[PDB]
Amino acid sequence: NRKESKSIKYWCLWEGAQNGRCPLLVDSEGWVKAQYEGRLSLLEEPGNGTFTVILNQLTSRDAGFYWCLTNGDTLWRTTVEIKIIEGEPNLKVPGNVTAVLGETLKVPCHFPCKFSSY
Amino acid sequence: ERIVLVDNKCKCARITSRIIRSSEDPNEDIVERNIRIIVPLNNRENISDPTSPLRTRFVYHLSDLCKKCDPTEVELDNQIVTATQSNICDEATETCYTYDRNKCYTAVVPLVYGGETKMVETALTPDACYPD
Amino acid sequence: CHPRLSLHRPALEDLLLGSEANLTCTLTGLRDASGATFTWTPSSGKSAVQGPPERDLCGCYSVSSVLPGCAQPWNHGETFTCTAAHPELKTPLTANITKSGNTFRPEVHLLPPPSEELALNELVTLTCLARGFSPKDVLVRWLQGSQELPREKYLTWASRQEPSQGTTTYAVTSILRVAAEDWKKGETFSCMVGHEALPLAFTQKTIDRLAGKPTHINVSVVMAEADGTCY
Amino acid sequence: CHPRLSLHRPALEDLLLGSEANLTCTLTGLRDASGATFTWTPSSGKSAVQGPPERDLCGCYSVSSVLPGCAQPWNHGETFTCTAAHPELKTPLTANITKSGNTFRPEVHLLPPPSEELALNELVTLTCLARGFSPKDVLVRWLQGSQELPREKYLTWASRQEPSQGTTTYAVTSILRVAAEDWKKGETFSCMVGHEALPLAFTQKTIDRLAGKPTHINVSVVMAEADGTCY
Ligand SMILES: *[C@@H]1O[C@H](CO)[C@@H](O[C@@H]2O[C@H](CO)[C@@H](O[C@@H]3O[C@H](CO)[C@@H](O)[C@H](O)[C@@H]3O)[C@H](O)[C@H]2NC(C)=O)[C@H](O)[C@H]1NC(C)=O
Ligand SMILES: *[C@@H]1O[C@H](CO)[C@@H](O[C@@H]2O[C@H](CO)[C@@H](O[C@@H]3O[C@H](CO)[C@@H](O)[C@H](O)[C@@H]3O)[C@H](O)[C@H]2NC(C)=O)[C@H](O)[C@H]1NC(C)=O
Ligand SMILES: *[C@@H]1O[C@H](CO)[C@@H](O[C@@H]2O[C@H](CO)[C@@H](O)[C@H](O)[C@H]2NC(C)=O)[C@H](O)[C@H]1NC(C)=O
Ligand SMILES: *[C@@H]1O[C@H](CO)[C@@H](O[C@@H]2O[C@H](CO)[C@@H](O)[C@H](O)[C@H]2NC(C)=O)[C@H](O)[C@H]1NC(C)=O
Ligand SMILES: *[C@@H]1O[C@H](CO)[C@@H](O)[C@H](O)[C@H]1NC(C)=O
């Protein structure tokens, strides 16, 4: 709701084994669940009615139902389901690179022609 | 009476549909279509007061009520493509026969306050025009 | 036994759903296609990779080279002018390609099943018809609910020119056979047609049993002296 | 080029409308020109007539062997073996044919125009459809009233085969656009399909207006002093 835009935002994953539970994966005050170090981020764009959260580096373990929380007076809780299908990523970078102790670096990142306008 | 096809509020028309699947002759069944029209007996032709006589001719084109003039999203292979939905969606312009409970309708009238005239604004539907 | 060089456009499938508008410059009928070079008038990704000399009618050689590039300049209206530097002759031959002009946009219609198929209660036929379009390329797919049906379940014909009421326009057709049980239950079907003259490149029509020609019609006219508001 | 001998079957367009079904056993690929002539296996009352040759890729030859003896012994069940002999490798080639069995009938549907076209006062469009027949030979005509329309006012596609389980079947379409003044007058139109497995060799289907007109229409006028509508 737009009239409580100064709130705190959460991102919890449905466990669903004993009774149902949301372990908190990330928040707005800068705390990450340590298993998700490097592949989770909550962002504030576009604002004014919405916000985004980005989950990459997908394996087939991540197929689950996800919930979003805020500490506002009114509580909309919305459910998103992530599936996993067959294919390969559009962007391309190598495997996790190394670097020298004290010398320059360069890392490419491809993108196909659908992403040329962007 | 169970699934709604259109509910149009500029002309106040509503069209529903239902399959009346009976038991005798278990191979044939009918399809019913209900149309409801509410006719306003005291509105003007343009919705602004002094213009024209009260409207006396009401015309409903069912090919225009039923159309969908807006894009939509389709997933073809592994993609999200934006499609249109009709062959007739070029140019609001449609004349409205009734009001609509969720929209203001205001007018402009000149009056006198000693010297100059003014540009008084006037509510035509007073329930919908509070500034909130 | 004779040279003749042609230029083929990009396709429609890879340029609408994607944008990877590769080109191809190839002639067939040479004499000594072993060492040769090719010309393309601009070049950015200059790795125009060679290929094997696939034989043709009565066994003469054929060149093979692909020009890359994608669908922003072909949409903007550029030009490409590939010609040859053959090992078999003395003065080359020229051909060019551009985006097509004076384009009309199609009209899509979906036709419900015929009446006598609904009595026999095995399988019914849908018919998608697309009409009046000046370039000769088109795409036709099918959807059930929101799921794309795979391509082996429907039959689509080719594109041919209709009788000429002044200017040359074309036509295409397609059919799909589904089960009578789930047409009577209430599933919905769609035919999605994509041609480049359309403004958003695609258009869709959806049809189900409830939104069709009825057998019963009830009409109610209510005269309201109270108000003119329509709640 | 390369030598090959094949042969044809008589065309349906004058097998059902006449009795001049000329067969053909033509060979193609000959180092020298025509010096060959033929021999047919039955004794059908005439012998073959040979025509002047034609040109092909780089110098290949082809002549024809027409057997005009069609007093219909073909659907009677004969076999009609051909035999040619050329100044080439000394093997006089052979060729078979049979008029096959395992046939099926087609099922013909004639569809009414879509609604958007009707509400626009221009040309309206009609659709014929035939499907399910076992050999891929068929004819499609049209009729307005009783006069047959000339064959350059309608478009018809090829005959392709439809995906199913095992038993191979084929399909074919055709369209025809008439003026809306002709439709709303009350003139009828007909599709007509010729096929070999039909018992009387043809099938009609006729459409006009009043086709799917509804059976019931209720009109109720609720005057004020009685208004009670619901949300
Ligand atoms: C139905 O009646 C209304 C009321 O007149 C018509 O709307 C308005 O018509 C006037 C005609 O003088 C237009 O005048 C404009 O006024 C504005 C003031 O905001 C001024 O900035 C302009 O330069 C011009 O003088 C006005 O465009 C128009 N629309 C509004 C106020 O929204 C209406 O056209 C009538 N409908 C029909 C179908 O006749
Ligand atoms: C239509 O033409 C085809 C060939 O173009 C004919 O089919 C062939 O017929 C021959 C003899 O009738 C078959 O040869 C067989 O060889 C075996 C040896 O394994 C032998 O044991 C048999 O007694 C017989 O001689 C051959 O299999 C067959 N098929 C081919 C070549 O694919 C056919 O006869 C012609 N139609 C008519 C009506 O004659
Ligand atoms: C990407 O490769 C690097 C290379 O190891 C991994 O990053 C860390 O590497 C150090 C030293 O090799 C280890 O001590 C850490 O345990 C690694 N981090 C983690 C989270 O395991 C990194 O794991 C690789 N990326 C992924 C997604 O596995
Ligand atoms: C493309 O090659 C053709 C060769 O067939 C060139 O031909 C001319 O095309 C223009 C149309 O753009 C005509 O107005 C001329 O009359 C054509 N010339 C002749 C002799 O017929 C053409 O020059 C090439 N395209 C460009 C852009 O130069
Ligand atoms: C937020 O969205 C509403 C919706 O119309 C808009 O009126 C408002 O101006 C927007 N606020 C900002 C800061 O963009």
Structural notes for this entry:
Chain A is built from no helices and six strands. Chain A is mainly beta. Chain A has one domain. In chain A, strand 3 and strand 4 form a beta hairpin. The two termini of chain A are 30 Å apart. In chain B, the strands form three sheets. In chain B, strands 1-2-3 form a three-stranded antiparallel beta sheet, with no helix packed on it. Chain B is elongated. Chain C folds into two domains: 98 residues, no CATH class; 133 residues, Immunoglobulins (Immunoglobulin-like, Sandwich), CATH 2.60.40. Chain C has 231 residues and is mainly beta. Chain C is elongated and about 90 Å long. Chain C contains four helices and 17 strands. In chain C, strands 8, 9, 12, 13 and 14 form a five-stranded antiparallel beta sheet that branches. Chain C has a four-stranded antiparallel beta sheet with strand order 11-10-15-16, with no helix packed on it. Chain C has a three-stranded antiparallel beta sheet with strand order 1-2-4, with no helix packed on it. Chains in contact: A-C, B-C, B-D, C-D. The complex binds a molecule of 3 linked components (NAG-NAG-BMA) (2 copies), a molecule of 2 linked components (NAG-NAG) (2 copies) and 2-acetamido-2-deoxy-beta-D-glucopyranose. A molecule of 3 linked components (NAG-NAG-BMA) binds next to loops of chain B. Chains C, D: This is Immunoglobulin heavy constant alpha 2. Chains C, D: It is a single-pass type I membrane protein. Chains C, D: GO terms for molecular function: antigen binding. Chains C, D: Its main location: membrane. Chains C, D: It is found in: Cell membrane.
What labels would you give this structure?
part of a larger assembly; 4 chains; A: 118 residues; mainly beta; 4-stranded antiparallel beta sheet; globular; C: 231 residues; Immunoglobulin-like; 5-stranded antiparallel beta sheet; 4 helices; 17 strands; elongated; binds a molecule of 3 linked components (NAG-NAG-BMA); binds a molecule of 2 linked components (NAG-NAG); binds 2-acetamido-2-deoxy-beta-D-glucopyranose; Immunoglobulin J chain (chain B); secreted (chain B); disulfide bond (chain B); protein homodimerization activity (chain B); protein-macromolecule adaptor activity (chain B)
